[PDB]
Amino acid sequence: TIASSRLRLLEYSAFMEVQRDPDTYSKHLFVHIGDPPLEAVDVRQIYDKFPEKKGGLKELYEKGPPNAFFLVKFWADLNSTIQEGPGAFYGVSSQYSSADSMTISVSTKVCSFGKQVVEKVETEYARLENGRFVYRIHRSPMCEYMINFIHKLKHLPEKYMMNSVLENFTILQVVTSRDSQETLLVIAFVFEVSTSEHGAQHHVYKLVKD
């Protein structure tokens, strides 16, 4: 599980969905997240995979707190398991929870060669649920940048070529209290392609400075 002192990620899910007919929908998951301790990774080995001026990962980690910084490696499933109808939905669903009511800002920077090409910013409002606070982003539609990228990768003949492109592709998710701008949760994403028919896999690491 991925949790700072202040906020916990419960679910993250990137997917495409197709309407075979008005009453029938196929949904394919690219990546999914749904309590062990975590192996550590030096944060200084990923500075080069994210923007590094002001608002950069180095200055974020230095601002603290350190209990907030994770790395997820995703084995993304890019199999055509659902028949490719044109005009399909490409979406991202995620849930967070906290003990305290707060208004959170969720920054999702898509990076190529350690440079921002897309930032998505969504403000989410606490909902009281079973004595805790929950934040739902439900079927947040993907940008054209990401849907094209997913098209480019699937039209490659060999998985090793996909993994070659993916080496230079990273996403940084930063969750802040809208008001205080206090860092609640930071998750660096790195990607390879899935080969096993077990499907999409993921590994979680703690980011440390040493």
The binding site for ligand G9O (CB under 6 A) comprises 14, 30-31, 76, 92, 108, 110, 118, 120, 142-143, 146, 150, 171, 191
92 makes contact with Cl ion (CB under 5 A) = yes
User: Which residues contact residue 67 at a Cβ distance below 8 angstroms, ignoring those fewer than 6 apart?
Assistant: 4, 5
Q: Among all residues, whose Cβ is closest to ligand G9O?
A: 120
Nearer Cβ to ligand G9O (61/191) = 191
d(CA 39, CA 170): 20
Question: Which of the listed partners (Cl ion, ligand G9O, none) does 7 bind, with a CB threshold of 5 to 8 Å by partner kind?
Answer: none
Nearer to Cl ion, 9 or 92 (CB): 92
CB of 123 to ligand G9O, least distance (A): 14
> What is the size of the binding site for Cl ion (CB under 5 A)?
2
Q: Closest CB to Cl ion among 166 and 171?
A: 171
In the bound state with ligand G9O, the residue whose beta carbon lies nearer, of 72 and 133, is 72
Q: Which residue's CB is nearer to ligand G9O, number 94 or number 133? A: 94
Name residues contacting Cl ion, limited to 93-132 (CB under 5 A). 108
Cα separation of 146 and 205, whole Å?
A: 25
CB 145 to ligand G9O: min, Å: 7
Query: Could you tell me which stretch among 55-63, 89-97, 141-149, 199-207 binds Cl ion (CB under 5 A)?
Result: 89-97
CB of 134 to Cl ion, least distance (A): 10
